[PDB]
């Protein structure tokens, strides 16, 4: 079942429907950007649509192909955004072509927007009735000088991933630096090529036996010292 309130479900029974409104939120905090709020249309005052107090500005956005299924391939709906004045290209050249971000689609009925969107003022406003979905941007299939097409995907979709992440190595580590297994917290001692530096900005392990010996954590080495198992 869905988290649909009783009031909106009851309203979604009558013949004389209201106007469906779709609003989009592009979240880039996890990738290094900001939160952008878009709406396909504006109110009667020629103003950004106000919902839950926040404002969605008008911009041509169109999402097509939302197909949830359990078999076959995954779902890859398409989002089209007008690229005029180079606005999309500006963030694309900066945010690595909008790869890894999140998109949230909220759909609302017209009779529940804030009262400031209507000259008479809606008395039926209720800023808690909407339907929410989230997806992740996969690629920018085409961004011309007039438009831009993004492919969407489910966050939990598996593609190109293998289950047994463990890999057996001979003289190379397998985990990160200082994360969980390299319980190192002392001063910087080494760098990429195992040089005796003492600066923290250049401290990165070489993923070798010599790096471990330098950092005195050879007891936590991921590379088994077999090597000569296939020669004999």
């Amino acid at each position: 079942m869905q988290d649909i309130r009783q009031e909106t479900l009851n309203e979604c029974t009558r013949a004389e429907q209201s106007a469906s409104v779709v609003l989009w939120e592009i979240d880039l905090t996890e990738v290094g950007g900001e939160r952008y709020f878009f709406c396909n249309e504006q109110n009667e005052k020629g103003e950004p649509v106000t919902w839950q107090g926040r404002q969605y500005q008008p911009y041509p956005i169109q999402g097509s192909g939302f197909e949830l299924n359990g078999k076959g391939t995954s779902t890859r709906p398409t989002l089209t955004v007008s690229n005029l004045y180079g606005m999309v290209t500006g963030m694309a050249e900066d945010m690595q072509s909008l790869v890894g971000g999140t998109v949230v689609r909220r759909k609302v009925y017209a009779r529940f927007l804030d009262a400031v969107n209507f000259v008479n003022g809606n008395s039926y406003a209720d800023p808690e009735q909407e339907v929410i979905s989230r997806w992740r941007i996969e690629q920018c299939s085409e961004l011309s000088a007039v438009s831009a097409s993004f492919v969407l995907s489910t966050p939990t979709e598996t593609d190109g991933a293998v289950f047994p992440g463990r890999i057996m190595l001979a003289n190379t580590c397998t985990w990160t630096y200082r994360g969980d297994e390299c319980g190192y917290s002392g001063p910087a001692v080494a760098d990429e090529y195992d040089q005796p530096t003492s600066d923290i900005t250049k401290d990165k392990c070489s993923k070798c036996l010599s790096g471990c010996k330098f950092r005195n954590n050879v007891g936590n080495f991921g590379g088994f010292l077999s090597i000569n198992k296939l020669s004999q």
Binding site: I4, V131, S133, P155, T156, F163, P164, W175
Partner: protein, 246 residues
């Protein structure tokens, strides 16, 4: 925490708490596979992206003390696996779901699982709630194929009694053999260490293949669209096929 891994008895309401303990359950095996760092592709998806309550319901369903052939009492499905080869994540997920007879969907912005567990009707539809596109008939039925209806299935399972070796057990129906032809199919039951579980899996496949043979496509108005999330049970009250007035 609510789960006791010794007698598999639940007691009280469950919270989002966890306890590190041994287990032999199945749904929580998938949970450990899916959301685990280091080796279980936990870096791709967080803990909040998977419906743990559906997993809890599945795990509660996986311990029902079905009767076995020898007269004993054993759990329905139990995971005893040793994954020793690297393979695609989707393959392992599909194997787990096939063993559990479940299917995964991205429903309600959270990955969830649906099984063929009997439940109560959610909604009802008649001819006035659907649309005839151009041909005048809104409901569109179809059936399975004669060569597609399997009647004999051979399942491979590991036999701990003799030598921990593979063994094939076959299941068939005499009346199905009399009605249609003989359709033999092979299957590998995932993590099976008991003849009863393999027999139950084969019987479920042949039964759910012999009974459910009708699939219908139709259309739905916007008001009922979001109302039905998906993978639910309902009734299609049609007055054209029932030669009456629904």
């Amino acid at each position: 925490s609510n789960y006791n891994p010794q007698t598999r008895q639940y007691s009280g309401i469950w919270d989002g708490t966890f306890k590190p303990a041994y287990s032999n359950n199945m749904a929580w095996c998938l949970w450990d596979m899916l959301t685990h760092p280091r080796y279980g592709m936990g870096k791709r998806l967080g803990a909040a992206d998977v419906d743990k309550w559906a997993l809890y319901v599945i795990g509660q369903y996986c311990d029902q003390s079905v009767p076995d052939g020898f007269g004993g009492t054993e759990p329905r499905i139990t995971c005893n696996a040793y994954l020793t080869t690297q393979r695609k994540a989707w393959d392992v997920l599909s194997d787990f779901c096939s063993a559990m007879r479940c299917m995964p969907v991205w429903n309600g912005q959270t990955l969830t699982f649906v099984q063929d567990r009997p439940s109560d009707k959610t909604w009802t539809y008649n001819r006035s709630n659907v649309v005839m596109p151009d041909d005048g008939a809104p409901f569109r039925y179809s059936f399975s194929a004669l060569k597609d209806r399997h009647n004999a299935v051979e399942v491979n399972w590991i036999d701990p009694n003799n030598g921990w070796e593979t063994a094939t057990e076959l299941v068939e129906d005499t009346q199905a053999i009399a009605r249609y032809g003989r359709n033999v199919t092979k299957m590998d039951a995932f993590g099976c260490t008991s003849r009863g579980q393999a027999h139950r899996a084969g019987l479920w496949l042949i039964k759910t293949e012999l009974l459910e043979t009708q699939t219908v496509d139709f259309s739905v108005g916007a008001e009922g669209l979001r109302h039905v999330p998906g993978d639910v049970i309902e009734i299609c009250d049609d007055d054209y096929a029932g030669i009456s007035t629904g």
